């Protein structure tokens, strides 16, 4: 699909077989989801950007479907204000910027 | 061009006569540059990011050339960690996401 940028590029994702809305964010190295009680082992991590850093939990090899495209990789969880799909998963679904 | 996302999507811009490197950022509503001088009137504004809120200076109707494409629009200047081209200008240069 082609997603224009007039509005925030929010799409449906599936993690755990369940659906969420997430922002396709070419300005994010990593994927970070709003706080959710995901099972599995995790490691603490700090992620930063405008306004400083937040503490998150890093989960590895988590399957995630993005607009019907399967992906699997590292998923961070913490107090982000919006679910964010970063480049680690954007590359897996073959996403490009085009102009 | 078509830009893949295995690396940060960094491009050269020209603004106020000067060259800089900036990140093409679909996760940003606005364009935010690191501290610099720009001519003309500015307004104090605040914006949010992953870590919280920061203070910026808003310059309106600023010409900016992005990877060879012309835009004229709002540029925010403040303590961002990286120069960011957001959707306000990505739309002007005809940028879309594709997968």
């Amino acid at each position: 699909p082609q997603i224009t940028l007039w509005k925030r590029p929010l799409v449906t994702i599936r993690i755990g077989g369940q659906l969420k809305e997430a922002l396709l964010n070419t300005g994010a190295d990593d994927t970070v989801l709003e706080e959710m009680n995901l099972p599995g082992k995790w490691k603490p991590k700090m992620i930063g950007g405008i306004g400083g850093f937040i503490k998150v939990r890093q989960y590895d090899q988590i399957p995630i479907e993005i607009c019907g495209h399967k992906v699997i990789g590292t998923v961070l969880v913490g107090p982000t204000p919006v679910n964010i799909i970063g480049r680690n998963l954007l590359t897996q679904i073959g996403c490009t910027l085009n102009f | 061009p078509q830009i893949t996302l295995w690396k940060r999507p960094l491009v050269t811009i020209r603004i106020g006569g000067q060259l800089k490197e900036a990140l093409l950022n679909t996760g940003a509503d606005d364009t935010v540059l690191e501290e610099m001088n720009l001519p003309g009137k500015w307004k104090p504004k605040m914006i949010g990011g992953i870590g919280g809120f920061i203070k910026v200076r808003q310059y309106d109707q600023i010409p900016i050339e992005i990877c060879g494409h012309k835009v004229i629009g709002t540029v925010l200047v403040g303590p961002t960690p990286v120069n960011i081209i957001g959707r306000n200008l990505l739309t002007q240069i005809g940028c879309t996401l594709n997968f």
Binding site: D29, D30, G48 | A28, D29, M46, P81
Partner: peptide, 10 residues
Amino acid sequence: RPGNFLQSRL
């Protein structure tokens, strides 16, 4: 390094 450049108006 800082690496999540979410940015929102308001």
